[PDB]
UniProtKB/Swiss-Prot annotation, chain B:
Function, in words: ATP-dependent chaperone which probably uses the energy provided by ATP hydrolysis to generate mechanical force to unfold substrate proteins, disassemble protein complexes, and disaggregate protein aggregates. By recruiting and promoting the degradation of ubiquitinated proteins, plays a role in the ubiquitin fusion degradation (UFD) pathway. Has a role in the endoplasmic reticulum-associated degradation (ERAD) pathway which mediates the cytoplasmic elimination of misfolded proteins exported from the ER.
Misc. comment: Present with 78400 molecules/cell in log phase SD medium.
Assembly with partners or alone: Component of the heterotrimeric CDC48-NPL4-UFD1 ATPase complex. The CDC48-NPL4-UFD1 ATPase complex interacts with the HRD1 ubiquitin ligase complex composed of the E3 ligase HRD1, its cofactors HRD3, USA1 and DER1, substrate recruiting factor YOS9 and CDC48-binding protein UBX2. Interaction between the complexes is mediated by interaction between CDC48-NPL4-UFD1 complex member CDC48 and HRD1 complex member UBX2. Forms a complex composed of CDC48, NPL4, UFD1, UFD2 and SHP1.
Designated name of the protein: Cell division control protein 48
Covalent link Glycyl lysine isopeptide (Lys-Gly) (interchain with G-Cter in ubiquitin), residues: 33
Source species, domain of life: Eukaryota
Listed result of changing residue 27 to D: Moderate reduction in growth rate
Secretion signal span: none
Highest classification ranks of the organism: Eukaryota, Fungi, Dikarya, Ascomycota, Saccharomycotina
Swiss-Prot record, chain C:
Organism: Saccharomyces cerevisiae (strain ATCC 204508 / S288c)
Subunit note: Component of the heterotrimeric CDC48-NPL4-UFD1 ATPase complex. The CDC48-NPL4-UFD1 ATPase complex interacts with the HRD1 ubiquitin ligase complex composed of the E3 ligase HRD1, its cofactors HRD3, USA1 and DER1, substrate recruiting factor YOS9 and CDC48-binding protein UBX2. Interaction between the complexes is mediated by interaction between CDC48-NPL4-UFD1 complex member CDC48 and HRD1 complex member UBX2. Forms a complex composed of CDC48, NPL4, UFD1, UFD2 and SHP1.
Cross-link (Glycyl lysine isopeptide (Lys-Gly) (interchain with G-Cter in ubiquitin)): 23, 40, 64
Function according to Swiss-Prot or TrEMBL: ATP-dependent chaperone which probably uses the energy provided by ATP hydrolysis to generate mechanical force to unfold substrate proteins, disassemble protein complexes, and disaggregate protein aggregates. By recruiting and promoting the degradation of ubiquitinated proteins, plays a role in the ubiquitin fusion degradation (UFD) pathway. Has a role in the endoplasmic reticulum-associated degradation (ERAD) pathway which mediates the cytoplasmic elimination of misfolded proteins exported from the ER.
Gene field: CDC48
Residue window of the full protein shown: 280 to 348 of 835
The protein's name in its UniProt record: Cell division control protein 48
Effect on the protein upon substituting residue 33 to N: Severe reduction in growth rate
Length: 716, 66, 66, 67
């Protein structure tokens, strides 16, 4: 560790142009009380100050007032490199201008009042870009050094000519420096951000390493993923943190109908990027201007493809310039464009996980004091399908809605601003709930009965999500598939939603005959699209309904519909367990006819859990009636036991129909729930399930129990 | 009458965008036809139309009040 | 207004209007009949319309807090 | 019908403009199974544009110009 770099500490000496070092730091690096030293901090900025021996300082970090600290764009607890510069000498002239809001109210001779006594006999060491502060006349004015004659930095001896003007430009040019994006504004893309960061900055920080190893670095990054991920934000952050020039080229903007004009625009953009400096080119949406040269009919698209292939590779093609792309489907790009030298690196910037979403929530709520009792765990667990560009809109909508609901009584600054309204502002949890309201709403309570089925589903779903490290210690992959069967109106979809709602996974519930088409390949393309959208966001539970309508136990039909059924079954068998990686896919089936399923999806590894969901008894219907009437004004005179005793084989759909008829009679009496509504609705029951299907399901369950034979406690 | 399902999808999207509204489906038999079994291209189109209508009407909560 | 921006001087007119509205005071700009300036960018085929749409995009985005 | 863009509707537009100019007239649309084709996967939506242009050019027939 070279002792020439030090941290920022609070200031004892309240003077503007000064920093305090300790004496044991002075012997460790020869400097003096009058010595003028150059401070170079972050954001590629600098400043000049006077070093002075300070006993309290302690050699390791330096004291600097908030004015110096600001010019360097640092904070208390940030590192800076210090080094002396006596090459600087007395100024010829100086150009300071007052910042508007620090002089609103007064006028007249700012020089005689502020500047004259401030610079007098101190020969301050100033710098271009510096913003200093002068206290006097019951206020503190801020000037910005706009220009000096003796290079970037100079000293203000009594002979130095101080020029102030009274209509200056300041503050706006600084904020757009601080408003710049950075590595602290990126969340979730840690490994790919670090890879892109090193592959850009290692040629730029020191080319001597690549000179010693004797090879050229890659000059192409192909970014692909869903729209709204943060790829151009990452590219702008790398182009801002390094001394490049971010030039943005759009896909449909550069394309035109004039012949030889879009290629001229691409050549002009490449010449402008190669003319000034080593820069970073970001061509956005390249899939619109790369039609693979065979599916298109237009000549201009092939011409701009050839222009891109010529500008990216050829004789003296690129001289220290890297190009970045962005697309949604990376398969519709040229094999010559995805070659080495043009797009030699392909970076998968996908949907972030829970900790990355929490990092985005932390960095998007940084510039606002929200509350004291807002927990980000529910905000990171409930928004399980947010890509990252919707989180900023979510926080903006919550911050807008809080001020919108907090301005109905307090005035809207029509006469005078107030002092106590700005205190105790910010969003709360209900504002975020309204923002999430502006994908199912259950939490382990709307389902009634089936305690061992709920325990088994909770175990075999919640365990591979919560403990991956223990499973890598054990070295085994968990189970995926659960299959339900039984009578309709039993609660399979509610059980799937209740086991999907506690994890941070998505929910893709597709239907059986809503994927079959009359064309050739459309149903298998829809199956592949469903599985691609499932495995493109981990974790994700899949709810395949009507397996008896999908699978049909293919066998032999000898027809077009039979061949389509064979192709659908083979596509499902390949997508469930084939040549895949099975990262996080939870296929859950739900049918009412398990005899019409082929013996290949019921194979272990695909749908091994053959869980039967039976009909509820009276003690289970009590829990169903208690779970459906959760938030309902109830009467102390009603008996749910007397309602459940007279069911004798009803279903959850029939109980929901009874509850809906009772609510309809309640709203008819209104336009708590009374007992005569239930007494008049209990007569008009349905009982849609017959008796022979119960015998068939009981026979199938008895056959499944009798197949499990010669199995016991099994002493070794 | 994928485009034959996209028509019903963006009709109900136009309905849910301008809430409240009334979607008067005139001559319902021609659309639904009691999907059952027909075993043809017209049968497949009828089943896809009926499934789109059912999965785009049952997703209406107390919100958006069509 | 919309079509009163043309005569490379449409970009100069857009920059002139935005710097005039930013220089004087916190104020309000009224752009009536935006359908002439913004031709939806896909059905159009011109190039000064694309340039003036890109200028309006980079000038509307370049407004800071001050 | 034309292979270019816009001309396939501009032909119906200026044919109906010539019909509205020389009032009264009779426009005999022979073999309407090629213009007013049933809709029912397409070639891009050109026959739909032809049918829509014919519908919006046939709905603007008031008591005046009596075609
Ligand atoms: N990792 C991230 N960290 C912080 N903000 C992000 C992140 N990813 C996306 N955003 C936000 O999403 C918005 C859109 O992202 P941007 O990269 O600008 O375009 P795109 O929508 O193409 O990703 C940005 O305003 C940005 O604030
Ligand atoms: N155990 C239960 N507890 C509470 N409600 C139930 C229960 N079983 C069924 N229901 C109700 O019955 C309805 C059944 O609908 P659905 O799940 O789509 O059909 P199926 O049960 O045949 O899969 C659900 O809306 C649910 O509210």
């Amino acid at each position: 560790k070279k002792d020439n770099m030090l941290l920022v500490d609070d200031a004892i000496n309240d003077d503007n142009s000064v920093i305090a070092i300790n004496s044991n730091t002075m012997d460790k690096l020869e400097l003096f009380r009058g010595d003028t030293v150059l401070v170079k901090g972050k954001k590629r900025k600098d400043t000049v100050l006077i070093v002075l021996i300070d006993d309290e300082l302690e050699d390791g970090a330096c004291r600097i007032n908030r004015v110096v600290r600001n010019n360097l764009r640092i904070r208390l607890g940030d590192l800076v490199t210090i080094h002396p510069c006596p090459d600087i000498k007395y100024a010829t002239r100086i150009s300071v201008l007052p910042i508007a809001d620090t002089i609103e109210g007064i006028t007249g001779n700012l020089f005689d009042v502020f500047l004259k006594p401030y610079f007098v006999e101190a020969y301050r060491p100033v710098r271009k870009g510096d913003h200093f502060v002068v206290r006097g006349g019951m206020r503190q004015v801020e000037f910005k050094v706009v220009d000096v004659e003796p290079e970037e930095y100079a000293v203000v001896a009594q002979d130095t000519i101080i020029h102030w003007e009274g209509e200056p430009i300041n503050r706006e040019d600084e904020e757009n420096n601080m408003n710049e994006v950075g590595y602290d504004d990126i969340g979730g893309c840690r490994k790919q951000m670090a890879q892109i960061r090193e592959m850009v900055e290692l040629p730029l920080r020191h080319p001597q390493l690549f000179k010693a190893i004797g090879i050229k670095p890659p000059r192409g990054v192909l970014m692909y993923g869903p729209p709204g991920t943060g790829k151009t934000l990452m590219a702008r952050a790398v182009a801002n943190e390094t001394g490049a020039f971010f030039f943005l080229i759009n896909g449909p903007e550069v394309m035109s109908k004039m012949a030889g004009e879009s290629e001229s625009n691409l050549r002009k953009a490449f010449e402008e990027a190669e003319k000034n400096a080593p820069a970073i080119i970001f061509i956005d949406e390249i899939d619109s201007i790369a039609p693979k040269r065979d599916k298109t009919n237009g000549e201009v698209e092939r011409r701009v493809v050839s222009q891109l292939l010529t500008l990216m590779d050829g004789m003296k093609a690129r001289s220290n310039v890297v190009v970045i792309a962005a697309t949604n489907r990376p398969n519709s790009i040229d094999p010559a464009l995805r070659r080495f030298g043009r797009f030699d690196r392909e970076v998968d910037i996908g949907i972030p996980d829970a900790t990355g979403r929490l990092e985005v929530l932390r960095i998007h709520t940084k510039n606002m004091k929200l509350a004291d009792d807002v927990d980000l765990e529910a905000l990171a667990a409930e928004t399980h399908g947010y890509v990252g560009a919707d989180i900023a809109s979510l926080c903006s909508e919550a911050a807008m809605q809080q001020i919108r609901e907090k301005m109905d009584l307090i005035d809207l600054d029509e006469d005078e601003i107030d002092a106590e309204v700005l205190d105790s502002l910010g969003v709360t949890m209900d504002n975020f709930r309204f923002a999430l309201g502006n994908s199912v709403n259950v939490t382990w309570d709307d389902v009634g009965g089936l305690d061992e089925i709920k325990e088994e589903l909770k175990e075999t779903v919640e365990y591979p999500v919560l403990h991956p490290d223990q499973y890598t210690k054990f070295g085994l992959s968990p189970s995926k598939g659960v299959l339900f069967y039984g009578p309709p109106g039993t609660g399979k979809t509610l059980l799937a939603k209740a086991v999907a709602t506690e994890v941070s996974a998505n929910f893709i519930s597709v239907k059986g005959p809503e994927l079959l088409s009359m064309w050739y390949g459309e149903s298998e393309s829809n199956i592949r699209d469903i599985f691609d959208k499932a495995r493109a966001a981990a974790p994700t539970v899949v709810f395949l309904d009507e397996l008896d309508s999908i699978a049909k136990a293919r066998g032999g039909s000898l027809g077009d519909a039979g061949g389509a059924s064979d192709r659908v079954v083979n596509q499902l068998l390949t997508e469930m367990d084939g040549m895949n990686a099975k990262k996080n896919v939870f296929v859950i089936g739900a049918t009412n006819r398990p005899d019409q399923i082929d013996p290949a999806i019921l194979r272990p590894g695909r749908l091994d859990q053959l869980i039967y969901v039976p009909l509820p008894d009276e003690n289970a219907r009590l829990s169903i009636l208690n779970a459906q009437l959760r938030k309902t004004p109830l009467e102390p005179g009603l008996e749910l036991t007397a309602i459940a005793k007279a069911t004798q084989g009803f279903s959850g759909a029939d109980l929901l129909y009874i509850v809906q008829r009772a609510a309809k009679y309640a709203i008819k009496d209104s336009i708590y729930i009374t007992k005569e509504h239930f007494a008049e609705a209990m007569k008009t029951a349905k009982r849609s399930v017959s008796d022979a299907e119960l015998r068939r399901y009981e026979a199938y369950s008895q056959q499944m129990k009798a197949s499990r034979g010669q199995f016991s406690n099994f002493n070794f």
